[PDB]
Amino acid sequence: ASKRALVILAKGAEEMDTVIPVDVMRRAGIKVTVAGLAGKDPVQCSRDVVICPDASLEDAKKEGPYDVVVLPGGNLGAQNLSESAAVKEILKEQENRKGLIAAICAGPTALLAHEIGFGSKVTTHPLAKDKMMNGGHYTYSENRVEKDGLILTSRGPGTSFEFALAIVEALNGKEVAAQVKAPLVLK
Amino acid sequence: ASKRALVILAKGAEEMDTVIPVDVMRRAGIKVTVAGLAGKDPVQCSRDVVICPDASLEDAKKEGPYDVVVLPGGNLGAQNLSESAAVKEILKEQENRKGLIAAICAGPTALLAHEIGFGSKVTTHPLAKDKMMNGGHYTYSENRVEKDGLILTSRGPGTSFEFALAIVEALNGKEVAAQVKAPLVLK
Ligand SMILES: [Cu+2]
């Protein structure tokens, strides 16, 4: 069957960090659910782009499990993800079932908040490094995309294509990732 | 005062081609209006991301003029732009007042439909070349971003950052473009 992705969308999310992975994953034939943290209502992203989620997180979490859970960045978005009990439960379940978790920019700091994937090598946006590294629970990387087993992280809007294609490769393989990449006119 | 951008958003627009320039232009302090071609209602983009426009095109066109008019790509989006009498009027007015027009991916084919900027060097998505070149009214370029005076074109989602930063440079200068670029973690 087709692989399934859950993208958790909170107020203040970085819209580029959100839309590039959603679009690229759908190009890869992944069934993507854009789930609104706060409900079914439109979400005001960090640069004021307003995105209508496919479902509330409350509803989407009942339609699990997912082959990947994706956390976009944006400082305020990531803080909302970090403060959410529902997000904690979803991430802990995904970790327990050995499923992929992918987070970009400030997004990985939600992994710290929910005590997910300690001991992994991770990257973040450079400005989010100190928050991520508080307590030394991860090892930091400056790679544009970092994958330590089932924890996949990346740095920012400018690494969003690389991040998305890494998710595609992890779920659907190298050939599909290459086929999806070519029409994008990347470097 | 601040520069102003009009981004015309139609059903079937490529959401990456839309969101990256909106976000990057807002980072540059440009006042961006995301205007819905069909009205004020949510727009279903090519890969099913749903974006709520800031205003209808009908309303936004009354709040001109704009320092740049931006046409996103997406085959079906560009076709909707190409078929629109309102778009024709906006582009002709912008051309007449010697204002910047920027189009990405299949987007430049709307310039052909509305007879805008004939004689310019342009690029498009590779798959949109034949449509753009019908009649030989432009000269084709394989540059990732092409700027021939007031006609600025680009190739696809993977050139969207370069396209957006070219708009920023054209409106607010090289220094602002460099300052906006650095936090993005581009190549
Ligand atoms: Cu909406």
UniProtKB/Swiss-Prot annotation, chains A, B:
Effect caused by changing residue 45 to A: Reduces protein stability. No effect on oxidation. Reduced localization in lipid rafts
Cross-link (Glycyl lysine isopeptide (Lys-Gly) (interchain with G-Cter in SUMO)): 129
Post-translational modification (record): Sumoylated on Lys-129 by PIAS2 or PIAS4; which is enhanced after ultraviolet irradiation and essential for cell-growth promoting activity and transforming activity. Cys-105 is easily oxidized to sulfinic acid.
Record PTM N6-succinyllysine, positions in chain: 181
Impact when changing residue 148 to A: In PARK7; loss of protection against metal cytotoxicity; decreased detoxification activity on methylglyocal-adducted CoA
Enzyme class, first EC level, given as a word: hydrolase
Modified residues (Phosphotyrosine): 66
Catalytically driven reaction(s): N(omega)-(1-hydroxy-2-oxopropyl)-L-arginyl-[protein] + H2O = lactate + L-arginyl-[protein] + H(+); N(6)-(1-hydroxy-2-oxopropyl)-L-lysyl-[protein] + H2O = lactate + L-lysyl-[protein] + H(+); S-(1-hydroxy-2-oxopropyl)-L-cysteinyl-[protein] + H2O = lactate + L-cysteinyl-[protein] + H(+); N(omega)-(1-hydroxy-2-oxoethyl)-L-arginyl-[protein] + H2O = L-arginyl-[protein] + glycolate + H(+)
GO terms of molecular function: cadherin binding; copper ion binding; cupric ion binding; cuprous ion binding; cytokine binding; DNA-binding transcription factor binding; enzyme activator activity; enzyme binding
Effect on the protein of changing residue 9 to P: Abolishes detoxification activity on methylglyocal-adducted CoA
Gene3D superfamilies, A to Z: 3.40.50.880
Co-factor remark: Deglycase activity does not require glutathione as a cofactor, however, glycated glutathione constitutes a PARK7 substrate.
Lipid linkage positions (S-palmitoyl cysteine): 45, 52, 105
Gene Ontology terms: cellular component: adherens junction; axon; cell body; chromatin; cytoplasm; cytosol; endoplasmic reticulum; extracellular exosome
Tissue specificity: Highly expressed in pancreas, kidney, skeletal muscle, liver, testis and heart. Detected at slightly lower levels in placenta and brain (at protein level). Detected in astrocytes, Sertoli cells, spermatogonia, spermatids and spermatozoa. Expressed by pancreatic islets at higher levels than surrounding exocrine tissues.
Site (Cleavage): 148-149
Positions of modified residues (N-acetylalanine): 1
Impact after mutating residue 63 to D: In PARK7; no apparent effect on protein stability; impaired mitochondrial morphology; no effect on detoxification activity on methylglyocal-adducted CoA
InterPro entries: Class_I_gatase-like, DJ-1, DJ-1/PfpI, Prot/Nucl_acid_deglycase
Subunit field text: Homodimer. Binds EFCAB6/DJBP and PIAS2. Part of a ternary complex containing PARK7, EFCAB6/DJBP and AR. Interacts (via N-terminus) with OTUD7B. Interacts with BBS1, HIPK1, CLCF1 and MTERF. Forms a complex with PINK1 and PRKN. Interacts (via C-terminus) with NCF1; the interaction is enhanced by LPS and modulates NCF1 phosphorylation and membrane translocation. Interacts with NENF.
UniProt similarity note: Belongs to the peptidase C56 family.
Name recorded for this polypeptide: Parkinson disease protein 7
Naturally occurring in which organism (per UniProt): Homo sapiens
